[PDB]
Design a protein around this ligand. Structure first.
Ligand SMILES: CC1(C)S[C@@H]([C@@H](C=O)NC(=O)[C@H](N)c2ccccc2)N[C@H]1C(=O)O
Ligand SMILES: CC1(C)S[C@@H]([C@@H](C=O)NC(=O)[C@H](N)c2ccccc2)N[C@H]1C(=O)O
Ligand SMILES: CC1(C)S[C@@H]2[C@H](NC(=O)[C@H](N)c3ccccc3)C(=O)N2[C@H]1C(=O)O
Ligand SMILES: CC1(C)S[C@@H]2[C@H](NC(=O)[C@H](N)c3ccccc3)C(=O)N2[C@H]1C(=O)O
Ligand SMILES: CC1(C)S[C@@H]2[C@H](NC(=O)[C@H](N)c3ccccc3)C(=O)N2[C@H]1C(=O)O
Ligand SMILES: CC1(C)S[C@@H]2[C@H](NC(=O)[C@H](N)c3ccccc3)C(=O)N2[C@H]1C(=O)O
Lengths: 367, 367, 366, 365
């Protein structure tokens, strides 16, 4: 289907070939999407609209660490492995993005997955898995154990490079963003740092923001779109006619950055988010994690840093920073466009942002 | 002169009466502006385009502390008294915003100022003054001692409530923002938290960003404006026709917030900055400090907290957060509009964003 | 069993009645201790030497939050709920301390425990459980699913005030500290803060440090102790004859704000420092402090019965000294409470010898 | 005179040749010590008991940056240049340690010092000087402008390697630690990291702690010492008869910035060994830097070797070095600082050498 650019939304900068986080060499992505049941929710019996998204920084067979740094916009949420990142500037294993109710199950499943796949002596390196959440409470039976260990194994083992599925998939399945359907979005930038061009890739799991704040390409678009407010049982449940008939950001780069430099990359995510108008609600867990696929730490070995960058080198750093801002901005709009209307638990209905209206608005604003 | 709204720039939200940080009860602002000399720079002899801006959270006569919390967007800069704020959640004395070369002089001057005004028993409370900088290196003889202790005393003693002077004044005098003239800007929002309305006021000293990134009301306006690039000696010095013929954000609120809650307010500034397009350059020291004028700590006494707010109360917190984002966004545009064209050290000429073109663009975009 | 003071170890300050975290009124502690199997390890079959320790800040029936703040000494470990604490200065629900392999199971079990006990409208408040770990890898089948949901429920439901069991129990069951047996330890201080008194309670799950660095009451005691090095099947496995993480929970009834509780938590490092360890590269050493008087009713107005000035040295120094001293003592109490244990792969770790310790203390403090 | 070891205080580990931060090659230290006036304080006239201590990480002629990271024990104090360090993991120029009242003067003086010495194109790199304080308020006329630009220039220009003067010198001149005389202290450790040796050097400016908490070599010694309490005009002013800390860590280990933060976070453990509990207004800070991981101005960073954070053999050796050198630097300070009378005739005693030596002899036969 069309992505944001295909509907005429302009963005600044040059995307990588896939315009996705997988433009960064090494990165694989996998989703398991769990959609079952309709109507009234009973805890433990669905409906389920949930899942898990896996990102392997160096592919699924890697036992090595990647240099990493994080940032917090608003920390009302969970992201495990982050004390490790703060302390030693790297993490081992995959990143899992999922629904809040699944964190514990995913965390233990990743440990289980390592058994028989990792040398015994190396197993202890698999004991701080990285698992993050947003809450799919409006569309999904959160507490009801809809996600199984097999679902997690399937995402771990099925992850791959190449085009990344966006929208109502994996961890984003039951999410809501800007009062429209939330989900997964991704984008990349190839940025010129003098005579070297690096790739910055971003994947988001979006469950944040309000329709009234939303900007797409700078256009405050909430009031321009007619209808498409959420419903319950065929009754408008939000907006002017109500009653009538968190954000996870994962940044990959092939730039050979040190961990403190990656924290800097992570802190740029907030500027990209800011472009699109949201203001970080009190309980919106908005977090960013950045890693390098060129600065790798072989397990029990010497760190591999193929080149080294000066933080005060504006030509290099600004190109990277702008890449993060732009790819984050675009990943967020790509999510909205990829996400289709869904009806879930308790008959809650949330519309995907209307393509026809969006394209019409973009054409009028950008003749 | 006209402020941003007067030129047809739309913003969301409701400003306070003055649309300035002084809409928050207790707050006084003072500037001393130093403009002397023209032509080639000789270190120690100008030209000078610098100054200092003072913000008294509770007025110039207060010996008490205000609850406070900070945030960093990019920390390549100086802001003293911040270890204190991080540790004990309050600061004593005024906030000074100035040029980088002035920090030491301002810091000692603020100590000198307390002598004779503050009981010898309370003097030690005046020994961690709050002084922050952006670099006026393109228009000002930074190292040349253009700022005097008397200049600092004048700003401390002359500060007042009511309308706040914007543009090329005080600490902002010699600054450059988005490749246009930088300086001081301010805005406020009155925000509804249930049956209680709070005030959020913001003042910025802006020296950040690139013209190519600039958004005003979502409009990427750099390429829409014709000319007005900086010059040297009548020769265009930047942009397409080149060669041819940091950010300090101060947030005040009357909301009775605890220090950790004010950190949250400070972290919202990045989103407001994000709206206007900048991407935080490698050497751009972009910082935010938030304080409450209702949560006051009498010197050596019991903290006064007139009411208490739950962090998980979205109705109250989201109103405050949106206030910070909107006031920050507008304060940044207000700065640009207030700042006039200036020629400074080494005949560097930086244009104020052209009012006529800006108004024309806003009219075409927002009929 | 004797605790540290009973063996003649001197400490500074005044302990509470129970000399435990439960000296802070309303705090409840529960353990489930899992000890089964012997001999060679088979992943998935044990031997198991693990468990879980639960701390209910306001008791097991509370749905309210407590003001909270944390500190990191060395962050190579997991402690969930901590982004929440950093952001909004409070956490809901119990603290669980456990073995690394159990984190996910405990996390989901805590959610399950809320279902049926918590009004449906309030359930979302139970979605960021606080769970922390140290690694019982030398005595326990870490990956082998030895801990069950029922074990977690039992600790949650069985938690109580009063005296706290120490040593090889709950989360500390399979741990190793200063090359001796690790485990759970607790201590408290009653402090004079201006013209009121407050209690500072500390509980530790200790799995950190090296014998050669250990100080007890300032005495570098590792070299003064004879034998008691770990073994594997009869063969001494460390020390001169070889081949022949730390979780700190601080409770107080002082009405502190979140940022002030961060300051409390940052004092733990000083008390840790007193006892000699130097925080190894992979030693996850963490502290979390909460107030039981500054409470946040769910969806309501925070309750702060009095307010303290950070610059009030009389009040704050007393509280800080309390943390340092209670931490120092909790660490030694752990060592003394922990008995010799043989576990997975016939690994054997000795409890610090009571007779030698008492002897050394007697000679050092006649 | 004697240092702590000379009075029979035992410590763990192996000190460098100088037992000082200057065991890290290329580091230079300079003090300017300002002692003048006696009797009653009149603000602006003294008595003065203050000064400044300069540490040049790569020597005074370096225009380059050093990789760096910091830690806070209790942040009630000032240390400039630290936002820079947190953000970009390096700092340019010298570290200055001084009295609280002097921070602004020192900060501007460091800028002035660069003019004429640094190419104009490079001057902007000199605009975030690193200046830290503790408060000499009981012995010194803090607000009275006792420190001059010339004093600062002298410490900057006079700094050198080799032995480092301790006690009542430079920034530590008017300080008070554990209710005894405070000041400057330094120590070092040479550590074995697998098949390589590194040096960890520590210098402190100590103005912290209470006598009742003090431990030296594990001995709670405040109560074993008789008298030596502070006085004001012949009248005991503390104790039964009453009728902040800056830690600089240098290493030649090629550590990245986040790794140096870990080093800095070890300082608290060494502080903890000596008993203090970090008072509410005690600004206790640590800064660590590498002299081998250097960043040529406007150039490519130079990292001669790289270390894995999970390499316990290498990291643990370094961490223990910080802890031990911090512990010893604190005791070296006390022993180096002599009894001093200052503003308002306040008198603060150096920890008594005779009593300390006897206590150590009794505890460690
Ligand atoms: C159907 C709904 C999604 S619309 C909603 C309505 C009624 O209270 N409130 C909102 O608009 C609310 N601000 C909101 C809407 C979307 C995402 C987050 C918050 N009721 C919901 C639902 O029942 O889950
Ligand atoms: C006159 C000038 C301001 S324009 C500039 C031109 C030539 O190199 N470069 C820039 O555009 C540069 N990106 C820039 C411009 C403004 C603010 C920050 C960076 N030369 C300057 C000057 O000499 O001070
Ligand atoms: C219902 C909400 C108040 S919480 C939810 C979401 N926040 C998260 O997902 C976050 N990680 C989180 C916070 C608290 C507990 C568990 C998880 C957000 O914001 N949503 C609100 C909404 O739908 O309006
Ligand atoms: C010339 C610059 C590289 S530094 C300057 C400004 N940055 C600051 O003001 C900041 N607080 C700072 C950083 C370093 C030393 C002293 C102060 C920024 O960015 N400017 C660049 C520009 O004009 O292009
Ligand atoms: C085997 C070790 C290298 S890891 C262990 C312990 N550290 C922890 O428990 C910590 N939370 C952790 C770190 C990494 C993965 C999982 C858990 C520590 O230190 N131990 C060493 C030892 O026994 O020698
Ligand atoms: C007089 C004190 C209350 S402040 C002082 C010292 N703390 C500092 O030096 C610190 N950097 C600082 C804190 C506040 C203002 C200025 C400087 C400390 O503790 N001293 C107390 C004491 O002597 O009793």
């Amino acid at each position: 289907g069309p992505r944001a650019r295909d509907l005429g939304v302009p963005f600044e900068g040059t995307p990588g070939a896939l315009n996705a986080i997988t433009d960064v060499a090494g990165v694989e992505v996998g989703h398991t999407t769990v959609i079952s049941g309709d109507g009234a929710m009973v805890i433990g019996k669905g409906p389920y609209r949930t899942g898990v998204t896996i990102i392997h920084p160096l592919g699924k067979t890697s036992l090595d660490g990647v240099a990493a740094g994080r940032a917090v916009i608003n920390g009302t949420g969970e992201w495990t492995g982050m004390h490790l990142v703060d302390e030693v500037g790297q993490f081992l294993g995959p990143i899992a993005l999922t629904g809040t109710g699944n964190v514990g199950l995913v965390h233990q499943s990743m440990m289980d997955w390592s058994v028989g796949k990792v040398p015994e002596e190396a197993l202890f390196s698999r004991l701080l898995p990285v698992v993050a959440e947003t809450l799919d409470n409006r569309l999904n039976d959160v507490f009801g154990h809809g996600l199984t260990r097999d679902h997690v194994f399937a995402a771990l083992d099925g992850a791959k490079g190449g085009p990344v599925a966006e929208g109502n998939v994996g961890g984003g399945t039951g999410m809501i963003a800007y009062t429209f359907k939330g989900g997964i979005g991704t984008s990349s930038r190839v940025v010129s740092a003098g005579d070297t061009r690096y790739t910055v890739g971003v994947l988001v799991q979006a469950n944040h923001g309000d329709r009234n704040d939303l900007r797409i390409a700078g256009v405050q678009i909430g009031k321009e779109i007619k209808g498409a407010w959420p419903e319950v049982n065929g009754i408008v449940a939000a907006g002017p006619d109500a009653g009538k008939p968190s954000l996870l950001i994962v940044i990959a780069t092939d730039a050979p950055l040190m961990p403190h430099q990656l924290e800097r990359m992570a802190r740029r995510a907030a500027l990209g988010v800011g472009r699109n108008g949201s203001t970080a609600g009190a309980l919106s867990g908005e977090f960013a994690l950045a890693f390098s696929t060129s600065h790798v730490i072989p397990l029990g070995g010497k760190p591999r840093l193929p080149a080294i960058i000066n933080d005060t080198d504006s030509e290099t750093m600004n190109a990277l920073f702008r890449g993060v801002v732009q790819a984050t901005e675009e990943a967020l709009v790509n999510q909205l466009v990829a996400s289709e209307t869904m009806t879930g638990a308790n008959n809650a209905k949330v519309y995907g942002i209307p393509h026809d209206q969006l394209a019409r608005i973009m054409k009028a604003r950008f003749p």
